[PDB]
């Protein structure tokens, strides 16, 4: 999975075990491993604070 840190450089790593690559495609928000940067958990996208304000 060719990635870039949302606030850093770019890398290519894999998922943990069962993050369900089925729905996981370029664009969805994921988490990364502390050690190997590997994907540990994907999660829903942001909510952009101002939306909660409205």
């Amino acid at each position: 999975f060719i990635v870039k840190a949302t606030n850093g450089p770019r890398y290519v790593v894999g998922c943990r075990r069962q993050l369900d690559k089925s729905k996981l495609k370029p664009g969805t928000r994921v988490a990364l491993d502390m050690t190997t940067l590997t994907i540990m958990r994907y999660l829903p996208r942001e909510v952009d604070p101002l939306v909660y304000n409205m």
Binding site: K4, V12, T38
Partner: protein
């Protein structure tokens, strides 16, 4: 000397053939080592592949 020179022709061909043999088992050994190398070529790597760019 037919009972010396001719006979002396084997005084070294034995070690000759022994080393000609050993070259085969050492082909085997070096093949083992080359397979080890090819193994170690790409086993730690390609998992945390960071991305830059050629310049």
């Amino acid at each position: 000397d037919l009972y010396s020179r001719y006979k002396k022709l084997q005084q070294e061909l034995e070690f000759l053939e022994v080393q000609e043999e050993y070259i085969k088992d050492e082909q085997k050994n070096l093949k083992k080592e080359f397979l080890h190398a090819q193994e170690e070529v790409k086993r730690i790597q390609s998992i945390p592949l960071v991305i830059g760019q050629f310049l």
